[model samples]
Target: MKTYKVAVLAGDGIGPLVMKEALKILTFIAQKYNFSFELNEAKIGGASIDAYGVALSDETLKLCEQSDAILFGSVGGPKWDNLPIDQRPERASLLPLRKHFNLFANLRPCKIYESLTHASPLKNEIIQKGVDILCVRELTGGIYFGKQDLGKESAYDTEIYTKKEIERIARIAFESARIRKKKVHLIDKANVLASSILWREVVANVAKDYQDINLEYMYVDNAAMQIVKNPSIFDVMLCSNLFGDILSDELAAINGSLGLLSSASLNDKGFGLYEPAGGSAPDIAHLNIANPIAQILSAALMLKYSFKEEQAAQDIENAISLALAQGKMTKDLNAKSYLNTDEMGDCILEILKEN
Candidate 1:
């Protein structure tokens, strides 16, 4: 009976609802694979704010510190929008957690499922064999954490980077590329910004170590257009915090619904915070209509990246793909008559059990 400790943070809105589905899958996988998860559930985001007047409490942070990984649900909604910017769940809790854990690498995969090609913004012809891209982003550094100044008519936020930061994140990109398509496109503004120039130079130096990987430097502006023009050509798009924040969203939009994607923010030690790519759908909370695939996939990512359960992860993924191919989807996917959150979970679990 091998076991992995997990900090479960079901934030707000539909977070708890969808989280139930992900936990169901994890429990099933553990039984099938002869492992178990010690899920230490905790309050966060608006839930914490309501309970303790803060977004993330010390107790919750300590729980995360003791766990192997954080299995997170979405956070924030209209209810907490009135709070001060510094106290907002997104800015206060998530960012602080990332910084405290030193989770520097963020990986977001945008794939066009074969059965859902009709949902993609790009034509089926353009997508061809299907668009599978991994967006590797620098999470804990650069402009987001740099110095800032806010004046009545004058405001500025510095964009900064270190050689160490550049090298580390670049290695993650190249390493990920080796496992994917052996192609790495470093997206930055080397032509204009000093930080981008350092990124280009440092990444190139790192590329020398991985001679087999094909490294291409693309300016952020051109990379943006290329994503829409021809996304399949890109295997791994490595970027800075700001660029990744924007480009990953672009990649998600081109693929289709945000509900279908999952994101992982990881530290150097392999500890990660796995969460759905979309925000809390306050409008759909408690309705049993919100899609749970993203949360389910996030759990799969946690298993692979943190628990090293590759077979279990693949089993969950294959089950999802089969479910979609069989046209078992939720209301968001526009099926003839969609299933609810729990029903969708049952669908995937049934498929997984059969395997």
Candidate 2:
């Protein structure tokens, strides 16, 4: 049996709540599948700041360095909102982890469940075919990590991209598309930005190697509109940091709830940080009403992307889908007889066992 060392960082708000459920599901899967996790728990975000006076401690960083992958919960809330931009949990802890790990490829799977299509903002006709999209975002480069200056009157941030950076991410998108729908759409501002133009050039060059995958380009704004007007048409939506940050959120909204989304950030070496795409809901922190599906799905992504346990990942996904299909969900999913956090986990576990 393989024992994977995983760094578990359950940060502020409902992070701990949802993380607990995820762990339960993981424990069950490990027992049934004959693999185990040597979990190293660590604090981060406001939780770490309160305990160690820093967002990410040296010990926590070391633990992550020694682990196979990071199972990260949501971070940042009103308690840490007044901190300096560079010192905030989102920046200090999350950004540094990404840079240190060189986790540049961010994959967010936006797929609406057939039973939950009624929750989507789009018309039933549009979502009839299903809104399943894999958003491949360049995590480490672009305007987000580019040079910046805060002037007294006017500030400027540089948007830059190297050929190597664009090539690697483009390949990830194309390769991902090949396994799914064989379509890749590069979303950028090529009409106005030089960096975006370079992105187009390099990505096009990479596409030559993936001739089997149909490649298309759409401007950022048009892509956003199309995502709402018709989201299912996109198989893989590739983007830079800033563009992905904005558009992925739009994709989340189209799916109707951030609570159902999961994301994976990976380095070229296959090391990854799997996390929920939603934020820590401080308002509903300890109410036991917060949804754990995203966090559980994040664990499923870890199993697939980091551990190569494809069957385990697919099993968890199927269990969740079965649970939701039967209306076993939390308040966020508008269930008529909503289950609490633990109950929802139990419901999915029951489905997994029966299968």
Candidate 3:
């Protein structure tokens, strides 16, 4: 029997609440697919801070290093908000993990299901026109990875990039564009930032390699405006570290609730870390109302990217889409008599079992 070792980091807030639901789906699929998973649970974020004075302990990282792929839940909240910036889970944990693995290419797909188009802020006309945006973000480089200088009167962080980094991530975006709508918009502030200027130059050169794909460059500010005003025109929005993060979040909110967002971080060697795009909603901890669909789809992303189980991955996605079509929405989607966390999971399971 084939078995994949998975590290489960169900961090604070509603992290554990949704992570369990995704795991349930994973276990069910394992049996149907004739594969097995050995899920090793480890504490992270506030949970780990309480245990080891660190958001992600060295031991936990080592465990992840050994795992085939990782299934992560949310992390960070008010409890640890008072801690130093370096100790906060978002900064202390997640960033370091991405940097360690060189998980440079972050793919965030914001696909608001056609059945729930009414829930989106964009009109049905705009929705009918189509809005499946795949944001390819350079995760581990640029400003966030740059050096920091905190002085008595001034604080500064550098935004630096190597040509190789620009080339690789641009290729990621271009390849995805070839697979999708064959169009990509490189979003940056080449007018101001030196790094963005260099990015424009490098990515343009990479664009030459893909003559079949349509390519263009847009300033970051204009990109943000276009995301809401005319999102359908964008196929793959390739961006640097800061630009990508801001743009993807804006798209998620504009498209619909955060509950529908899911993301994947992948290294060049094909190892991946899958997780929901939203943070740990500390206020909703243990509440049955928190949506688990993002977490479930995140697991599906792992199946597709890391496990190479494309057929199974599409099956899970098709199941989620069908669940929404059948009006099996959670509280966030504003459905008539919406489901809670587990109830929604049950709905998807019922649909999958029929398959």
The lDDT per prediction is: 0.92, 0.92, 0.89
lDDT at position 182, candidate 2: 97
Q: How high is each candidate's TM-score? A: 0.98, 0.97, 0.95
lDDT of 2: 0.92
Q: What global local distance difference test value does model 1 have?
A: 0.92
Instruction: List model 2 lDDT by residue over 66-126, tens digit each.
Output: 9999999989999898998888888888889999999999999999999888998889999
**Off by more than 4 A, model 3:** 152-155
Query: Which residue pairs collide in model 1, if any?
Result: none
Model 1 is weakest, by summed lDDT over 10 consecutive residues, at: 121-130
**Model 2: lDDT of residue 271:** 92
Q: What is residue 295's positional error in candidate 3, in angstroms? A: 0.6
Number of colliding residue pairs in model 3: 0
Model 1 alpha-carbon miss at residue 7, Å: 0.3
Show model 2 residue runs off by greater than 4 Å: none
Residue 295 in model 1: lDDT: 97
- The positional error of residue 200 in candidate 2, measured at the CA in angstroms, is 1.5
